[model samples]
Target: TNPYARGPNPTAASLEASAGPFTVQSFTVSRPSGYGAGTVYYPTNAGGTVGAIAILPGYTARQSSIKWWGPRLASHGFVVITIDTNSTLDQPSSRSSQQMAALRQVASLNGTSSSPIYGKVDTARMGVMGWSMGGGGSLISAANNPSLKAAAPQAPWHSSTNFSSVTVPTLIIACENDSIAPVNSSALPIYDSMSRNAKQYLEIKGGSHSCANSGNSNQALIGKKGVAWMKRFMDNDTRYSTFACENPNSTEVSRFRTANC
Candidate 1:
């Protein structure tokens, strides 16, 4: 029923989503510059000609800490790479750069040739997901690089830091009750900073910045919504686009949405 499953089963049956049966695991991948190292999770049963997505942790979160979406992403045939940003030194700025460097290097090298990634990831289809500080990182990375394809952030804290450089098809996923990233100063500004030619914002209607990403209410909705959004642009699937740019009056997700937030 839930099509956003993860795995290593690649079988171009649908051309858009028919990629893998899927797989999941934690592995080390070389960064773009080859300086240090970044972590990547190969979701289970990777499928058809799908794209690769990297997941960046929140403020001080670790890569090993994120599980719910990682496995789910793998089940959906995505080469989900989750980065470890423990650099208390610069935070978002440093982590953002790390993800970009590694993403560019891997995606560029594998553009035409399919080495790993379950032999289904298009290499060309690349994007990033970040939350809070990490969200800011994804914005910066995508803003500077047009090749990023798509950028998605949940309850970001950028409008206060800066917004002179964001220019891409951004998806702003905000929490309705997030006090830290208040709508006006957080999501609103980030949305406005985007190119607008291909930008959408979805308010989750509850929770703060630390609202879980797997089993939690906000994270589950985001997982469902984010996967669809990513599929729409990454693999060119129109079915996933229906949930794009959901407005305030949009129907609530009865099944996935939480009742007491």
Candidate 2:
């Protein structure tokens, strides 16, 4: 049974420290192929298998840029893997390849009896997230792999924003004052191009490209929005609809848009 479903220990509507009733832990991936030896974060007692997600860092960035998602999501009843690309300077397409490989490794670990995540991952339900160029790669990954349950890209950037082919539920996190990846030129265009799926665009007021990265002051809201979106789409739980679909009166949110919320 899915412990995260609406009927059982109901999920919290927002992100909270030590939110779920589970102790989280981490383990190194076993000889990763397409990416660096990544780290996996998972709950010790989620009652049953739960959805898994893979996250990658931006160009020239390492796991530190996006690793906080590991503990945050895992504590909320999901397995999360944060990976380092084959090369720190890898572009969007290359990062997308590695992100998917890391996810496949997570599924493989579920079948390896010696692994900590053995039989713990709900391989059928998966999501992907990343930052900057890695975030752009996450969009590409969802576009190429239509089976992905959800995708969230923070301040994404790429050569093209025509991700209209993506059918996966997606949340585009944009920074209002980003010079590296201006919202008008990057995030919004990509969000606008995702015409065929359940999509959301959240612009963080006065935020920079690294606004949603680790140590950002908006973790409380960003974390809540992310977890809610994943639960809504990846787990198909309606309990999160209010959190994912409604707008909160926060000064941090500059703008919000949704097509299939």
Candidate 3:
């Protein structure tokens, strides 16, 4: 049996929708921990304790860059934390440290009796996500912490493209026309470097650097894939296997690749 599966049977429409099956609530962290600031999103009732996911923004960016993912992923049955870095100029390595710290804080909150999220998160299962430099941080987090269930980064940028050590399942979201971190040098190469994981590369057609960020028009597809990737790997739910691995072959996609899915 799929012990981690939390929502109803997913459909193309369900995954593409603006919201998922669960009711979501969010609260801003009163006293920031390792990260600069954070907004925690969680489902009031996800049937049982759920996994946690920490998402970070790119260099010079703030939580608004990745805030949409908070409720979106949380409503799908995950405790999602979207964080601002200690500094807007923080590099990928710093972002990586803060990302894991955010996850650690979530785990702490889950066990704190006075916390709203107390007992709501399954600390053993966690995931990482980010955009641009933050995306590179996600890869770094996956490489450094192989115990992480999944990593999904968008338009990641780092000094190095090699992350061969990462064995955690990953999904790289790329923008076809990204000038900030071109796909050829950043996202594509990073995706190629990981030869040991169940990884997928998804490039949005004619997209700019922030195509996968909040307020994007292609959430129908991007949202579906992101949710599916986390569900499939983080929960080991075969129900999302095809949705997570199959190529959409849509005109909206500029490129797509997968390995060991």
Candidate 4:
């Protein structure tokens, strides 16, 4: 049995608002290999090896934009690494490269001596996530790396709308009232273009491009969706089926769609 599996752990549960049961540990990786600096978050006592996720921030955005996810996801039995790109103004392509590099760094750290993440990560099970342009970068990461287990992009923005090449399961978090990276122009088109594998679209009612960020009013619902989607795909855990498939019963969600759910 998977000791880290979340059945009774609220922190690991899909709809829970609070951080999960595991004590979290964090560290910084300076100029890791081929990427910029990054902060890692992991469960101190999860009781089993768990998946890892790498997150990237948007154009001109710092790690603060997506830093909330590290603790949020790590508490749920996953290793989360939030990174700073070589440049704050780097585009999605560059961000994607950094995101993958961060993931590779985490995988390598799993076996490094004196590392908090030593023997704690299941390198084979990994995911990627981000916000705004970073979200688009995550999509690019998925499209370019077919072996990745999952991707969740929030208010994604990119020049290209064709991502049918992406075979990994993806969860796109769209914002209904976003002035930047408007869903009609960015997220929706990308979601519609993906045709090769499992995917989901979630539009948050009245949400801006930063709707999914930490301290947002919708974290309860957004966190539930993010955790569930990653768990279902990254961990290959069937227990999250309903959480990932069903239309979340929240007035905050404007629209929900799924393919291959």
TM-score for each predicted model, relative to the true structure: 0.73, 0.95, 0.99, 0.95
lDDT of 2 by residue, 146-207 (tens): 99999999999999989999999999999999999999999999999987899999999999
List residue ranges in candidate 4 displaced over 4 A. 1-14
- Alpha-carbon runs more than 4 Å astray in model 3: none
Give the clash count for each candidate: 37, 0, 0, 1
Best-performing candidate as measured by lDDT? 3
Model 1, span 123-180: residue lDDT tens:
7678887777778888877766777767777777753545546555577777767887
Lowest summed lDDT window (length 10), candidate 4: 6-15
TM-score of structure candidate 4: 0.95
Q: Candidate 3 has which clashing residue pairs, if any?
A: none
Number of clashes in model 3?
0
Q: On residues 1-261, what C-alpha lDDT tens digit does candidate 4 reach at each position?
A: 644465342332335665766678899885576666799999988777999999988888888888888888888788999988888888999899999999998999999888889999989889999998899899999989999999999999998978889999999999999998988889998999988989999999989889988778877788888888888888777778888778878889898989997
Candidate maximizing TM-score: 3
| Ranked by TM-score, top first | 3, 4, 2, 1
TM-score of 2: 0.95
User: Which of the two, 3 or 4, has more TM-score?
Assistant: 3
lDDT of each: 0.59, 0.87, 0.93, 0.86
